[PDB]
Amino acid sequence: MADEEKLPPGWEKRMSRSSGRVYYFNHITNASQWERPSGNSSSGGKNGQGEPARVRCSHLLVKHSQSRRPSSWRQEKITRTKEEALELINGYIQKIKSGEEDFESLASQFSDCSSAKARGDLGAFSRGQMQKPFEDASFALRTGEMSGPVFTDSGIHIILRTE
């Protein structure tokens, strides 16, 4: 996930190494699209959307004592706790959104969840994915703002958002 495709279920992105309008592929209707996965809003592209009912609202997950198991991907040990949990995030919180750090490295060298080795926990949805209190993040900024510590039924995540 968040490594191969970058769209909802049914439509896949190929990019195609050649200009001339971007096309799409389907399956549920054996029909080839040639416009955009429209249905709820104008996601993807770049910007311009009054009713953003679907975005790449991500949420990094830094393993810690406030998780299912305080185990480091490399260190193999995480004695630290909330004392370095919310802090560890603040260390990057003011750098990634500073156009001086693409959203991926931290996930491919820290994240524990899927984002760990999937360049992204989930990515984008159509309306809802999980934790209701989690969705209350993306729709509260202007892209590339990072929601920061949202505080949910897990510990401490970060909604970077890339759409």
Side-chain angles (χ1 to χ4, degrees), residues 6-160:
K6 242 123 62 71
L7 342 168
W11 300 107
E12 224 277 272
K13 231 218 255 293
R14 298 292 300 288
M15 234 196 158
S16 338
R17 55 123 187 282
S18 243
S19 351
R21 315 303 177 75
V22 178
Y23 65 91
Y24 301 77
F25 203 77
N26 214 228
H27 236 151
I28 193 142
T29 201
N30 75 105
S32 58
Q33 170 175 271
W34 38 44
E35 259 216 57
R36 93 210 314 283
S38 208
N40 300 120
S41 86
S42 205
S43 106
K46 285 99 201 153
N47 217 233
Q49 55 236 138
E51 50 278 344
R54 59 192 321 160
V55 267
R56 284 169 174 71
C57 161
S58 193
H59 46 195
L60 222 120
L61 259 133
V62 177
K63 61 270 111 110
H64 45 37
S65 168
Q66 288 86 230
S67 284
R68 266 41 171 76
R69 51 190 345 279
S71 203
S72 244
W73 263 64
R74 211 98 59 200
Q75 222 103 231
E76 218 328 89
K77 198 128 294 310
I78 314 221
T79 49
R80 255 106 119 278
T81 186
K82 107 158 91 309
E83 214 299 278
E84 268 244 31
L86 180 51
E87 195 53 274
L88 265 172
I89 298 293
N90 265 220
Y92 311 98
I93 276 233
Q94 187 55 93
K95 253 275 77 55
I96 285 177
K97 98 180 91 60
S98 199
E100 191 156 321
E101 239 313 327
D102 192 275
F103 159 75
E104 47 186 24
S105 30
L106 232 195
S108 31
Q109 79 130 92
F110 227 51
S111 170
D112 57 84
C113 219
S114 180
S115 209
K117 224 96 306 294
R119 186 236 314 289
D121 247 278
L122 346 170
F125 52 65
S126 96
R127 153 61 146 279
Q129 276 168 344
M130 319 180 155
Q131 11 57 353
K132 200 182 65 51
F134 133 98
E135 254 197 86
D136 207 67
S138 105
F139 331 98
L141 355 145
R142 189 46 45 81
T143 233
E145 289 301 315
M146 154 174 310
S147 207
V150 157
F151 240 132
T152 75
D153 190 6
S154 249
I156 314 178
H157 322 257
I158 344 171
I159 294 97
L160 204 296

